[PDB]
Symmetry: D2
Subunit: 115 residues, 4 copies
């Protein structure tokens, strides 16, 4: 528990929450298109063509990208939170395509469900 959680049943509640959202994604109509996720990306701020490729990829997915918020971290690094909505397949496709771009140093998905 000591990054230091506060008590006994505090690390476990946090686990049941992302267990329950993770069980949601597994057994829910593969083809349900309202699921939403956050893709967190850190990338080289001056990799030729990288930003344009990421834009192109997001625009070709269209309806599946709600917005992106970008932080200029420093001279070398940008962080983006890209908010996605679609089925599991469309969301994983997008994560993988952005993850496989030269200059992307980090591309991690957080799955979010409605309650």
């Amino acid at each position: 528990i000591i990054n230091g959680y506060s008590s006994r049943s505090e690390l476990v509640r946090d686990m049941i929450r992302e267990k329950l959202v993770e069980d949601n994604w597994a057994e829910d109509n593969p083809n349900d298109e309202s699921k939403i996720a956050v893709l967190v990306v850190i990338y080289d701020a001056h990799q030729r063509e990288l930003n344009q490729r990421m834009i192109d990829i997001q625009h070709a997915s269209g309806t599946h990208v709600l917005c992106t918020t970008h932080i200029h971290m420093d001279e070398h690094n940008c962080l983006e939170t890209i908010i996605l909505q679609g089925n599991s397949f469309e969301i994983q496709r997008l994560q993988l395509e952005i993850g496989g771009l030269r200059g992307v140093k980090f591309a991690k998905l957080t799955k979010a469900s409605s309650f």
Copy 2:
């Protein structure tokens, strides 16, 4: 290692719990430069999603995650670290 780092806290919360978002905001304002910004999607009548971008050493980031994630009405609060 007491190094400043960026992190994203993803929260889903009940769009109707009174005082919840006022509490979330008080915490973030009282944290000053450790919150960079928040983005919010109104997912449906009962749920809001926020991505809250944070900046600090891992102990400061942790204290923030605890404080926001422990609020009544918060259904999900998961942290991603640089």
Copy 3:
């Protein structure tokens, strides 16, 4: 020109751009629901009930609010850019309802059209 624009035809280009987006909003099918706008709001960070009311108002408009990005300016002030998509009427209704909340100090609309 001196906030200081650079030359002669530089202040005027900037005027033709928001003339042309402003002429767009005036004579385009009142009922076209794809128009998008940015509502910029500055508000009292600790006005009882203000944030909840703003959320309620945005959730009741639903599909018409794409996202909001919030900056905690200081102890007393928050800024938000609320991105809206709808017809002119839905967008103006929303601006007015947020503008008439106790604690909102500033609520200005920027209309954005596709080219």
Copy 4:
């Protein structure tokens, strides 16, 4: 009056002009703490909208608006001041 202020620069630009967004990003990174964050909506196949939140005195804010608004491929660039 040489006071730091917040401002929002709303930009619409061509989602296909090569080098445009790399230029926009270079300017913002080279401006350091005068850019707080950007939010981007992919409006359609040919247009992106960004809200770029800035911080600085009115001369610094102006220099930024000029630099970003003058880029080829930028179709609209309008500033809102606190």
